[PDB]
Structure formats: C-alpha cells, structure tokens
Amino acid sequence: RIRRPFSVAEVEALVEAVEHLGTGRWRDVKMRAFDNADHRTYVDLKDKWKTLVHTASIAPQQRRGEPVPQDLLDRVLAAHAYWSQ
DNA sequence: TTTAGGG
DNA sequence: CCCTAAA
Numbered sequence A: 001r002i003r004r005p006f007s008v009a010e011v012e013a014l015v016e017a018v019e020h021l022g023t024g025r026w027r028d029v030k031m032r033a034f035d036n037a038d039h040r041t042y043v044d045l046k047d048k049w050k051t052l053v054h055t056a057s058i059a060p061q062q063r064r065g066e067p068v069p070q071d072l073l074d075r076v077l078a079a080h081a082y083w084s085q
Numbered sequence B: 001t002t003t004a005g006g007g
Numbered sequence C: 001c002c003c004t005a006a007a
Helices: A008-021 A026-033 A042-055 A070-082
Strands: none
Touching (some): A026 A042
C-alpha cells in the first residue's frame, strides 16, 4: 500500500479512542475513530500507537513530518502508562 | 478474522 | 507498512 503520513486530527482521533478503550482492542478503536477511513486498518492504528509512544520519548528535533502537538504526545504517555497491564 | 510483536 | 504465529 502507498505511504500516507497520519495527520494531526487522525492522531487526535486515535488518542481519544485509546484513552477510552485501551491498547488491546484495535478493532474497536478502528470502529470508534476510523470507521470510514478505509486506508487505516486496525493494524495501522496499532502501529501508529507504537510510533506515537516512541515519538513522545524522543526529543522534538528528531521527529519527522508535520509536528504532532505536544498536547497529544502528552496524552499518549499518560494513556500508555495507564493501559499498561 | 483479530490479537500481538517482530520484520 | 509488512508478515504471521497464536488465539
């Protein structure tokens, strides 16, 4: 499949979704926040959560592409610490 | 088919 | 994004 960087709203929709469902229900996350975004499958969302956690763990100057608002990176690490077992 | 992780 | 063992 063709590349397709995640936009800020998509991240936003993902972050909101996970804060409510967690990290073990990507099919529900997909249904809740990307139900009509045919190019994003629950495996892609699982993957974007994996990169987002990393993105939030590195310095801003080493991130690539459109900048994810600090606000979201913040909720990624808080939702990651919460749903971690 | 979905979950869960490495490739 | 892909590949796919397990469930």
